[PDB]
Design an enzyme around this catalytic site. Structure first.
Site, PDB file in Angstrom:
ATOM      1  N   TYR B 143       0.842  -1.191   0.000  1.00 35.00           N
ATOM      2  CA  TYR B 143       0.000   0.000   0.000  1.00 35.00           C
ATOM      3  C   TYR B 143       0.881   1.247   0.000  1.00 35.00           C
ATOM      4  O   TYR B 143       0.592   2.173  -0.736  1.00 35.00           O
ATOM      5  CB  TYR B 143      -0.912   0.063   1.150  1.00 35.00           C
ATOM      6  CG  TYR B 143      -2.154  -0.761   0.966  1.00 35.00           C
ATOM      7  CD1 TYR B 143      -2.086  -2.105   0.604  1.00 35.00           C
ATOM      8  CD2 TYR B 143      -3.407  -0.199   1.093  1.00 35.00           C
ATOM      9  CE1 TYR B 143      -3.265  -2.841   0.365  1.00 35.00           C
ATOM     10  CE2 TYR B 143      -4.540  -0.928   0.921  1.00 35.00           C
ATOM     11  CZ  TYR B 143      -4.497  -2.235   0.480  1.00 35.00           C
ATOM     12  OH  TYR B 143      -5.738  -2.862   0.330  1.00 35.00           O
ATOM     13  N   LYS B 193       2.421 -15.885   1.105  1.00 36.38           N
ATOM     14  CA  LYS B 193       2.748 -16.494  -0.147  1.00 36.38           C
ATOM     15  C   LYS B 193       4.259 -16.790  -0.175  1.00 36.38           C
ATOM     16  O   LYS B 193       5.000 -16.321  -1.050  1.00 36.38           O
ATOM     17  CB  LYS B 193       2.283 -15.694  -1.332  1.00 36.38           C
ATOM     18  CG  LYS B 193       2.314 -16.499  -2.631  1.00 36.38           C
ATOM     19  CD  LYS B 193       1.214 -17.539  -2.878  1.00 36.38           C
ATOM     20  CE  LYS B 193       1.478 -18.205  -4.251  1.00 36.38           C
ATOM     21  NZ  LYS B 193       0.399 -19.160  -4.575  1.00 36.38           N
ATOM     22  N   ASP B 225      -3.764 -18.474  -1.417  1.00 32.47           N
ATOM     23  CA  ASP B 225      -4.703 -19.104  -2.308  1.00 32.47           C
ATOM     24  C   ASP B 225      -5.489 -20.265  -1.629  1.00 32.47           C
ATOM     25  O   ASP B 225      -6.740 -20.343  -1.702  1.00 32.47           O
ATOM     26  CB  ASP B 225      -4.075 -19.486  -3.668  1.00 32.47           C
ATOM     27  CG  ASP B 225      -2.821 -20.339  -3.561  1.00 32.47           C
ATOM     28  OD1 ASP B 225      -2.251 -20.461  -2.475  1.00 32.47           O
ATOM     29  OD2 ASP B 225      -2.326 -20.837  -4.596  1.00 32.47           O
ATOM     30  N   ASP B 249      -6.777  -7.393   3.272  1.00 32.05           N
ATOM     31  CA  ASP B 249      -7.838  -6.752   2.544  1.00 32.05           C
ATOM     32  C   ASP B 249      -8.757  -7.764   1.878  1.00 32.05           C
ATOM     33  O   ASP B 249     -10.008  -7.726   1.936  1.00 32.05           O
ATOM     34  CB  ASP B 249      -7.244  -5.843   1.470  1.00 32.05           C
ATOM     35  CG  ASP B 249      -8.290  -5.182   0.650  1.00 32.05           C
ATOM     36  OD1 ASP B 249      -9.126  -4.525   1.262  1.00 32.05           O
ATOM     37  OD2 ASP B 249      -8.326  -5.236  -0.592  1.00 32.05           O
ATOM     38  N   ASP B 253     -12.752  -9.445   3.579  1.00 33.48           N
ATOM     39  CA  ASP B 253     -14.004  -9.391   2.806  1.00 33.48           C
ATOM     40  C   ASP B 253     -14.628 -10.730   2.555  1.00 33.48           C
ATOM     41  O   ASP B 253     -15.867 -10.899   2.679  1.00 33.48           O
ATOM     42  CB  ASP B 253     -13.818  -8.612   1.531  1.00 33.48           C
ATOM     43  CG  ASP B 253     -14.066  -7.100   1.720  1.00 33.48           C
ATOM     44  OD1 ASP B 253     -14.134  -6.606   2.846  1.00 33.48           O
ATOM     45  OD2 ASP B 253     -14.161  -6.446   0.690  1.00 33.48           O
TER      46      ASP B 253
HETATM   47  C1  LIG Z   1     -10.771   1.743   0.144  1.00 33.86           C
HETATM   48  C2  LIG Z   1      -9.559   0.781   0.156  1.00 33.86           C
HETATM   49  C3  LIG Z   1      -8.315   1.593   0.033  1.00 33.86           C
HETATM   50  C4  LIG Z   1      -9.504  -0.037   1.464  1.00 33.86           C
HETATM   51  C5  LIG Z   1      -8.277  -0.910   1.511  1.00 33.86           C
HETATM   52  O1  LIG Z   1      -7.863  -1.452   0.439  1.00 33.86           O
HETATM   53  O2  LIG Z   1      -7.709  -1.062   2.643  1.00 33.86           O
HETATM   54  C6  LIG Z   1     -10.744  -0.897   1.635  1.00 33.86           C
HETATM   55  O3  LIG Z   1     -10.878  -1.898   0.655  1.00 33.86           O
HETATM   56  C7  LIG Z   1     -10.710  -1.593   2.973  1.00 33.86           C
HETATM   57  O4  LIG Z   1     -10.750  -2.836   3.136  1.00 33.86           O
HETATM   58  O5  LIG Z   1     -10.647  -0.896   4.023  1.00 33.86           O
HETATM   59  C1  LIG Z   2       3.016 -23.280  -6.587  1.00 30.56           C
HETATM   60  C2  LIG Z   2       2.688 -21.780  -6.785  1.00 30.56           C
HETATM   61  C3  LIG Z   2       3.939 -21.076  -7.188  1.00 30.56           C
HETATM   62  C4  LIG Z   2       1.618 -21.580  -7.879  1.00 30.56           C
HETATM   63  C5  LIG Z   2       1.362 -20.116  -8.131  1.00 30.56           C
HETATM   64  O1  LIG Z   2       1.387 -19.307  -7.152  1.00 30.56           O
HETATM   65  O2  LIG Z   2       1.129 -19.760  -9.333  1.00 30.56           O
HETATM   66  C6  LIG Z   2       0.314 -22.265  -7.514  1.00 30.56           C
HETATM   67  O3  LIG Z   2      -0.311 -21.726  -6.374  1.00 30.56           O
HETATM   68  C7  LIG Z   2      -0.670 -22.147  -8.652  1.00 30.56           C
HETATM   69  O4  LIG Z   2      -1.804 -21.617  -8.567  1.00 30.56           O
HETATM   70  O5  LIG Z   2      -0.358 -22.615  -9.781  1.00 30.56           O
HETATM   71 MG   LIG Z   3     -11.134  -3.927   1.358  1.00 30.71          MG
HETATM   72 MG   LIG Z   4      -2.371 -21.104  -6.589  1.00 30.71          MG
END
Ligand SMILES: CC(C)[C@H](C(=O)O)[C@@H](O)C(=O)O
Ligand SMILES: CC(C)[C@H](C(=O)O)[C@@H](O)C(=O)O
Ligand SMILES: [Mg+2]
Ligand SMILES: [Mg+2]
Lengths: 364, 364
Positions: B143, B193, B225, B249, B253
């Site tokens: 950020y 990650k 992921d 973030d 959500d």
């Molecule tokens: C508005 C945006 C910059 C903010 C963020 O990314 O932190 C929002 O998505 C949040 O989760 O508070």
């Molecule tokens: C193993 C990892 C590097 C890979 C990625 O992050 O692309 C996997 O999560 C994917 O989705 O293929």
């Molecule tokens: Mg957000």
């Molecule tokens: Mg992946």
């Protein structure tokens, strides 16, 4: 003439599902008169055991001599205790993508008729169905940007990674997305964080530039955080989702899990010449390896994607797809696709492969 | 002595839900003998209309003179057509976080008894319940990292953002997470990650360093992921989730949407001195503003969090929480929490506020 396929089955269930993909491919070769030669190479965990590294030079050179790579799954308990950066999944996949410039990743996911109940969504949401194609940019962004590393020591030791994108990189993946949407339901949803990231500002700008070539396709933009929510509420409203590297990594897994049926999902990673790497979406499931339980459908559909996109054999690709559909609606299901009161109806890995290969031979 | 609160109600439903939070706070002030003074300032959309920018200097200075900020919601159709970077949500929030060094974001989410059905998860999953506290690092990472920008032109025009973290930044947010887990179910799940990002390698390493001070708390690491998937399968197994800025973030959500009840969710953003900004998790819902429909619970719980964390008034904070519980189990629900065959039972924004304030006065 002859096609050459590099076969990188990997670890865990890879070899047993690969054997079924080969079986189906033999039925295809016969039915359509294709001449395909296969060479097998070690990758991942098995490669660390046999050669000392997850991507041996002999395997890399073998892939350079092929028309496509048919890839299984890599990784397992055994190698996890290694540091996450010298470690078989990343150690095989990142250099393969970088070396062959496999910028385009396609991850199709859909809810199959009759299997809506396996989804973890509430029944009224899953009853609506969905069919989403995730297009992920695979060679740019924060995965390969420089500088990357660390400096300093103690409390002030710092690490850094750089997310970088150029207009050229963005327009080539966007075009793919728009061309796909044109064959589907003509909507592209581009996913970004344009309220924070400079790369996302450029992303959104370039996608809108590309859009002028596709006035029949509707374009919308959504923030990545909001996208994770919306997929839980209205997954039926998305068609093609267009993502940068890291956002696509995240969203494609979310969408895969929403199917409840990861054994059915395949992935294609391709460069602009048509060469690609085709793989099941799930992992190596090492706890079930060698028992004849694993679902080979994802590996079989990977072969179908390979025939389509790298070998330009559309009819052969389609025939496999239809053989898979026939299995699914004739009650040929593996254990993980049945409620466990039904579990005794489960077919084994070989039964699945036999059925599908037989369907192709029969002219499905 | 006196506390001073800066009140930044913002746009859309902000003012109507803020009025109910003030009403509840008056009942608290009386019951516990607290002396609190409030000053109201423009922020967001209303600030662009009245002052030309989303965060006027007079508002910023007003927040500097306060013990805490009680924040509503910002944004709406009207300002969306502005470029995403000059634009009210980011324009208010990023400078406030940066200026006051609000490094710690807490986003508690739980499924309330009796409302499991509003979750978009399959009924057997939501019946298990969940209660997850997301701890997000708010002032570091991608950020605010430098360099950030673009260069070049045409096809080779490139944008770049830098994700940076120091050991000092990681250890201060990790400690918060571990201390929270110790009061809850003693598990921290750190999300990273680490197979790709240098920052994530450092992250994982530092979290393991901090862990030695908390041998009673179980620590696990999961890739971002994979975390998006696991929250769909076993949300009941997570307690505290510890995330960097961008990963938090995204995950916060996802988790919010899994409740199906965003009107109930609040957020705290704090610095090390206890000053903070307290806000509802959802947006400004401009289509329902001015109708008496909006659910004021999230804004009321924000006030409770403000009392706890910034004003160190634990008993007053708890009393509000219990008044909210009494409303929810006495059938005081707003429209969005009822099936639409039940919709005629809905309470209005004012009825909710009256009920909750009355409960506090009655000694709940
Ligand atoms: C508005 C945006 C910059 C903010 C963020 O990314 O932190 C929002 O998505 C949040 O989760 O508070
Ligand atoms: C193993 C990892 C590097 C890979 C990625 O992050 O692309 C996997 O999560 C994917 O989705 O293929
Ligand atoms: Mg957000
Ligand atoms: Mg992946």
């Amino acid at each position: 003439s002859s096609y050459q396929i590099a076969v990188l089955a990997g670890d865990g269930i890879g070899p047993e599902v690969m054997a079924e993909a080969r079986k189906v491919l033999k039925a295809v070769e016969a039915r359509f008169g294709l001449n395909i030669e296969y060479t097998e190479y070690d990758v991942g965990g098995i490669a660390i055991d046999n050669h000392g590294c997850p991507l041996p030079e002999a395997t890399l050179k073998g892939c350079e001599a092929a028309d496509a790579i048919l890839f299984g799954s890599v990784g397992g308990p055994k190698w996890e205790k290694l540091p996450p950066n010298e470690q078989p999944e990343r150690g095989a996949l990142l250099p393969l993508r970088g070396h062959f410039e496999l910028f385009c990743n396609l991850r199709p996911a859909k809810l199959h008729d009759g299997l809506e109940h396996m989804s973890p969504l509430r029944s009224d949401i899953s009853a609506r169905g969905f069919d989403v194609l995730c297009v992920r940019e695979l060679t740019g962004g924060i995965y390969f940007g420089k500088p990357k590393g660390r400096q300093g020591e103690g409390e002030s030791e710092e690490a850094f990674d750089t997310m970088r994108y150029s207009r050229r990189e963005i327009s080539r993946i966007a075009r793919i997305a728009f061309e796909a949407a044109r064959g589907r339901r003509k909507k592209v949803t581009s996913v970004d964080k344009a309220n924070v990231l400079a790369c996302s500002v450029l992303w959104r700008q370039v996608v809108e530039e590309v859009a002028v070539d596709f006035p029949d396709v509707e374009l919308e933009h959504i923030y990545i955080d909001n996208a994770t929510m919306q997929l839980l509420r209205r997954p039926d409203e998305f068609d093609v989702m267009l993502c940068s590297n890291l956002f696509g990594d995240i969203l494609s897994d979310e969408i895969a899990m929403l199917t409840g049926s990861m054994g059915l999902l395949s992935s294609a990673s391709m460069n602009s010449t048509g060469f690609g790497l085709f793989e099941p979406a799930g992992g190596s499931a090492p706890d079930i390896a060698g028992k004849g339980i694993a679902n080979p459908i994802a590996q079989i559909l990977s072969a179908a994607l390979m025939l389509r996109h790298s070998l330009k054999q559309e009819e052969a690709a389609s025939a496999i797809e239809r053989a898979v559909t026939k299995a699914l609606n004739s009650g040929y299901l593996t254990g993980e696709l049945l409620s466990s009161d039904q579990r005794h109806k489960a077919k084994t890995t070989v039964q699945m492969g036999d059925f599908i290969a037989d369907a192709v031979k029969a002219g499905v």
